Amino acid sequence: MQIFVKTLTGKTITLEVEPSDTIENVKAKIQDKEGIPPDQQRLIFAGKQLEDGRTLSDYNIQKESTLHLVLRLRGX
Amino acid sequence: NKAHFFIYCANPCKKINTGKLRVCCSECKHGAFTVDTDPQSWADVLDKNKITGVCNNVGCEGLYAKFYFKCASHPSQGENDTAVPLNLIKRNHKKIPCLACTDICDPVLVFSCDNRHVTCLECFKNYCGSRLKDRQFLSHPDFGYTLPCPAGCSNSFIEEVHHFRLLTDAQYEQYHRFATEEFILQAGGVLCPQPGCGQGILIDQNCNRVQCSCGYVFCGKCLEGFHLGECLNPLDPEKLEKARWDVLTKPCPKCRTSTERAGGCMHMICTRANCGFHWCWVCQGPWERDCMASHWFG
Ligand SMILES: [Zn+2]
Ligand SMILES: [Zn+2]
Ligand SMILES: [Zn+2]
Ligand SMILES: [Zn+2]
Ligand SMILES: [Zn+2]
Ligand SMILES: [Zn+2]
Ligand SMILES: [Zn+2]
Ligand SMILES: [Zn+2]
């Protein structure tokens, strides 16, 4: 299935993904498309920050639904 | 219309429909699993490892049941095809009016408050639509951006966010964005003050100098250009009480005796001496396999 990753900027990324994919695997797909380090990536769905350990199916995230990408900036 | 399960079907229906309840082995995920105790509430279905049983897959030593759902408006495609349970949506079999417009609608939305207030779906749309525009949704630490009962009752927060799929797609897309924005704000994070860029940034605990992805360097505390030092500068109780979810008898198909529903389960065994018939409360006939799928409880 494909999901959307959207930032509050308005930039939208399409990701071919599986429900059994961990968020960590999703982050890698974003880095492969935008170069953003996973350490600076943080995905939020319905106001909940997704943890890398859990998968997409655990959050009942459906096809053609959108995750939100928010940056984690340090140092105032 | 004998369905008691409502789901959201993303593909291919992209809408809310009636749903079929299924059960498989929690261990090996094979559809052949026999349940020992019928589900009586949504907690039996949603909570994990709550009901034991037997797995018909040879060799498998699994004990617990896994309940999932399918859309009942399109033929299943693959074993992976599943739907999301919208547990708060129920059949208004009690003919309970809405707390807002006092209409006897069907189906309805019943909040999980200790008091179980009831709303029709249209009022629910208007309830969410209004409270979204006024940034009145709460930013829950466990459930995310959500809403409680309109009466504001304890422990009534919506947990399955796909209930908001009852809303317009524009509102739902807005719901998620607002969800992200106030997630940032509640987490101590910041939103880039730039007009062209309102990036969501999770800054450090004590960070003044924030530099967004757009390159703009601004103050985290006052949201202005970066600097040093100090930053310069309606519910009617009459309606609500009547619109309350929290006597009724039906004859047995095998002996015509008067029977009352004990719990939430629809699978009923006649308590009469001569007749131990397995029958369904909804169909007023014999307990079939589709009764499990269409209306096992509720
Ligand atoms: Zn469907
Ligand atoms: Zn099994
Ligand atoms: Zn109403
Ligand atoms: Zn309430
Ligand atoms: Zn910016
Ligand atoms: Zn300042
Ligand atoms: Zn009987
Ligand atoms: Zn039935």
Rounded distance from Cα B92 to ligand 5 centre (Å): 49
- Output the CA angle B110-B111-B114, nearest 5 degrees: 115
Resolution of this structure in Å: 2.6
Q: How far is CA B264 from CA A73, B37, B114, in A?
A: 50, 13, 17
Instruction: DSSP letter for B165, please.
Output: G
Q: Which residues of chain A lie closer than 8 angstroms to B183, CB-CB?
A: 44, 47-49, 70
Say if residues B271 and B254 touch (Cβ distance below 8 Å).
no
Is B180's CB within 8 Å of A70's CB?
Answer: yes
The secondary element (H helix, E strand) that includes residue B139 is strand B138-140
Is B176's CB within 8 Å of A63's CB?
Answer: no
The secondary element (H helix, E strand) that includes residue B291 is helix B289-295
Which residues on adjacent β-strands are paired with residue B129?
none
B235 closest CA partner among B112, B93, B127, B122: B127
Residue B107 CA to residue B95 CA, distance in Å, equals: 10
Burial class, B21, CB count within 10 angstroms (exposed 0-12 / middle 13-18 / buried 19+): buried
CA B41 to chain centroid, in Å, comes to 13
* Sole residue written with tokens 């961990």: A22
The secondary element (H helix, E strand) that includes residue B240 is helix B237-242
- Measured in degrees and rounded to the nearest 5, phi and psi for residue B179 equal -60, -40
Which residues on adjacent β-strands are paired with residue A13?
A5
Is A63's CB within 8 Å of B10's CB?
Answer: yes
Of A8, A19, A74, the CB nearest to B180: A8
Technique used by the depositors? X-ray
Q: Which residues of chain A lie closer than 8 angstroms to B172, CB-CB?
A: none
Q: Domain map of chain B by residue range?
A: 1-298
Q: How far is CA B233 from CA B210, B219, B221, B222, B236, in A?
A: 20, 14, 12, 9, 42
- The DSSP bridge pattern shows strands B33-35 and B53-55 to be antiparallel
- The DSSP bridge pattern shows strands B258-259 and B250-251 to be antiparallel
Which residues on adjacent β-strands are paired with residue B244?
B117
Residue B42 CA to residue B124 CA, distance in Å, equals: 21
Q: Domain map of chain A by residue range?
A: 1-75
Write out the two tokens for B99: 């707390």
Which residues on adjacent β-strands are paired with residue A12?
A6
Sign of the CA dihedral running A49, A52, A56, A57: negative
Which residues on adjacent β-strands are paired with residue B191?
B200
Q: Which residues of chain A lie closer than 8 angstroms to B202, CB-CB?
A: 42, 70-73
Query: Which residues does B107 contact at the CB level (< 8 Å), separation at least 6?
Result: B6, B89, B90, B91, B92, B121
Residue B200 CA to residue B276 CA, distance in Å, equals: 63
Query: Which residues does B297 contact at the CB level (< 8 Å), separation at least 6?
Result: B4, B38, B39, B40, B41, B42, B44, B264, B265, B266
Instruction: DSSP letter for B164, please.
Output: G
Instruction: DSSP letter for B135, please.
Output: T
The secondary element (H helix, E strand) that includes residue B172 is helix B169-186
Q: Which amino acid, one-letter code, is at A22?
A: T
Instruction: DSSP letter for B286, please.
Output: E
Q: What is the rounded (10 degree) CA torsion for A51, B82, B139, A24?
A: 20
- Measured in degrees and rounded to the nearest 5, phi and psi for residue A30 equal -75, -45
Rounded distance from Cα B176 to ligand 6 centre (Å): 29
Residue B60 CA to residue B274 CA, distance in Å, equals: 39
Contacting B with CB below 8 Å, chain A residues are: 1, 6-9, 19, 42, 44-49, 60, 62-66, 68, 70-75
